[PDB]
Subunit: 304 residues, 4 copies
């Protein structure tokens, strides 16, 4: 292996072109993005056979400084005329390979830095502010792109993936975990009604990479829509396990977005431990945080 690059390249852009013209689904009100404020955290990795002597001999002649990669990304966010993180990565990648002909491969990650709207009173009414936003440390969209230079100096995308990370969902009832193996290693009781708490990271891959860019926005799959599918399916389903839930989420995603080829889940179980099972004159209960060990699941659903 031989790569180098820059991580935590934060870049915040005001007044990116808005995303509109999207295709709606039943599970989501999502209709676009205003883009008054657009934040992204970028990681860039580059490789190429001609970088070998930068390691073996300390020869920096063909080294693009990682600080210069940071400048490149931040300057390109200023000149980007598109509407998605996916399209921003394509713009950076193509531009970088065109600039540096000795680079054979570039890999990019972009993570949304999300902001939410806030309320303000003016002119006699309360409305969402066009100026003041709230930083969110909850779920966020992601994008991944890898591009190569071939022998003829043409460029090709070699992998693209979009995602939603950091979704944390708890369903207070309507979940069971029963019927698992009971042997000399089993101390977990069967539970016909648990408050399942799952962390979800969901990633999708398009059949046609062009649909990821937003240039024809009706073919874009928005992380907001994926989020809303996940919450709807969790609500709708008497869950039998996390494994069962994520399969059903993935099936719904692929049904709503026929332009997707596959969806990949990384899930974790953070369900609370029960303290009080019955409260006089109430349907409530009390729970608390478990010990650190967490279950996890990794699963792909494909159109096939």
């Amino acid at each position: 292996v031989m790569y180098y690059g820059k991580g935590d390249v934060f870049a915040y852009r005001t007044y990116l072109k808005p995303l509109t013209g999207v295709r709606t689904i039943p599970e989501s009100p999502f209709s676009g993005r205003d883009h008054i404020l657009f934040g992204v955290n970028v990681k860039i990795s580059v490789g190429g056979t001609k970088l070998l002597t930068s390691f073996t001999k300390g020869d920096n002649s063909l080294v693009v400084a990682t600080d210069s990669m940071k400048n490149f990304i931040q300057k390109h966010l200023a000149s980007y005329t598109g509407t998605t993180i996916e399209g921003f990565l394509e713009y950076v990648a193509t531009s970088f390979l065109k600039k540096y002909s000795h680079i054979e491969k570039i890999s990019l990650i972009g993570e949304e830095i999300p902001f939410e709207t806030t309320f303000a009173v003016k002119n006699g009414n309360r409305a969402a502010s066009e100026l003041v936003f709230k930083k969110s440390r909850n779920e966020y969209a992601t994008a991944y792109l890898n591009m190569v230079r071939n022998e003829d100096n043409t460029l090709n995308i070699t992998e693209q993936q979009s995602g939603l990370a950091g979704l944390q969902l708890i369903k207070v009832s309507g979940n069971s975990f029963v019927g698992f193996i009971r042997d000399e290693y089993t101390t977990l009781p069967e539970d016909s009604n648990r408050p399942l708490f799952v962390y979800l990271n969901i990633k999708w891959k398009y059949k046609n990479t062009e649909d990821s860019f937003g240039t024809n926005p009706e073919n874009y799959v928005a992380a907001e829509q994926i989020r809303d599918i996940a919450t709807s399916v969790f609500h709708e389903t008497e869950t039998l396990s996390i494994q069962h839930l994520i399969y059903l989420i993935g099936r719904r995603i692929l049904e709503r977005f026929p332009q997707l080829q596959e969806v990949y889940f990384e899930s974790q179980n953070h369900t609370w431990d029960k303290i009080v099972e019955e409260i006089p004159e109430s349907e409530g209960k009390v729970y608390t945080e478990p010990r650190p060990p967490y279950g996890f699941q990794c699963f792909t659903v494909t159109q096939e």
Copy 2:
């Protein structure tokens, strides 16, 4: 000093009595709390002269185990019939001093563990779920209560404070920082239009402790309402500094809630560094994260 206790006592309750009957303000739609899910992280500290030998001699005779304090808190969340974190702390404190007559002082912190609503489709329409909620790692309500046992075995509250913590607000324009001291230590340029990014922790104290409990909910001051005041005032104000902003927020809080005696702010400056000042054919700009050092302000506004 001589105290001991338990921290990170997480407790999650389903179906707490809902908070309703609140008094509204122009800046906020807030109208109550459903309390389908109510999470709190509690810290308890206790003291008393009769605990001295637990330190000086290793005599545990009068030691309530900190693990038992955890049980006490979690069991009392199950039996709590009120509607606020403030009232929950009062219930725990009074109950604990009544149980343990050798304890002279108790201090409690409760921090909300907030959950947000999610969307689900059922019966032909999309609506907010009554079952599936999203864990929020953004701003959260707080409460503080200290109670003492006097010589006659009567109990008194000796300090109460409510709060909002973890609010992170960025205003993209309409903020200046000019006119500060320019001497041999000054390298900061004057800036007539910066994207001010502030972290806010806001705490308030009631004139009458009873109003904090929710028993007559029209006198309660909700953290949600305080949040919405903060965002409105930030939007409304051409800010001249963070100091200027927080004074104005505090004045608005005290005007809207005459039952409050004072409000206290801890603010931090996290404003981004500018990278690109002018973009062809756009009003946008690009910014990035600053170096670690952060400014901060601590300020009290009183009805007087």
Copy 3:
């Protein structure tokens, strides 16, 4: 309350004057610091009645920018000719009040950013490198100082405290927790031999603030020495609780350092849950991490 300032002012200096000739105690090999690399994270807070209009009116006329306070701290680390964090804070505080006559109060915290030695082969044998150091995320020294301007324009230190933060110690055996209250709320079993795991933050105050500066190193109390007292006392003591342990650590500190007036402890309990009590043909056991709730204690011992 009316204050403002700057936090997370990191400042690293190479080749600070070495601290040498500190009086040793039996529990610790410490006698000084080479200061090839000296790192500190500073927080500065300032107040004064003349700052009122910066809040009430948005008037920045008397505002020293917090960015300028960062420059002030960093430049003063370059000009500091002393040997301790405590003395550096005094130098910053005195200098700032002398510079800015409208400021009536300054509070400073300094937190060591610690670096440990590493091995390098020099002339065929391993020795400590004089160039390569390892950044440590374990325990670190601390210092606090509050200085005011009086009505007669003299400057006065009103509060000083030094400390050791982030010490995490686990003693595998030789600890009990028995005899506590057993009532309706008690589920914890008594334990005559637990692997007590404590986090310790230890703070001390000097009788004479000048001793904190290091100018006469013989009277300086080093956080490294406090660390080694804590480990020695934990080892020597069949503990009966954390409360019992911290009292005994405090007494030993005050006995070793008669120039101190007080020692203050903030401790937390992080003892593991036992999973396997007996292993064939072994004295060992298996444990795991507990649920999140943690006990804590706060206690002052005075000289």
Copy 4:
């Protein structure tokens, strides 16, 4: 992809069999581990075609609960008679596949939870305590293993890697970064003498997986030895970049350990920004923390 498992399975064992008799290298004093306290954080992942319906149908008939995998790991730390994390993973993997015939693949990660010795006064002199240890949040050893069941029902290790994570090293002088591309995107100045601060994660693969287990300790490669090679090489080398440094560390590792097939590096640059270039009557400088963006390098050296 179709896998599931358990993460953050902490397990602490007292009095694991000591690791002794490891062949030493010049850069390191390491020859063994006392194992009075042995901590590991384990992650387990399992797969098999017979798990399909647990996802597609909600059928838990063939689901080993992830909670039960936690019990399995913790009980096997109690019964483990060997001396290394690598060997513990092999024991868990073999045992799990032998127990659960429907599982075709198991992947394990083990991360050391390191504890350092402390001083106690014993018979009038400081010595290392045999009871009191300090939890370290610095560098730690790692191990990875993937084992499969073949069609003929033999079990086979398909991947093994050991490592050292979290090493943070700063060399105050004797580092340059010059000669890189200067074009429209370049603002970084050349620097002939920077205080290079690197984070290093170093991973190695053995030619013969058995050598990783420690059964013949003479062939075991200890993370402590890798650490000390890295510090020695950093000290000895006038570095020309991180890229140059990690290549040289890798070559030294492979020279010292002919039983290794490869070494893999993940490095990050955290070098401070210079604030004060010259201090009167001193060789020292002042630096501060940079903005967040960090450089990184990934590189394999092969035997």
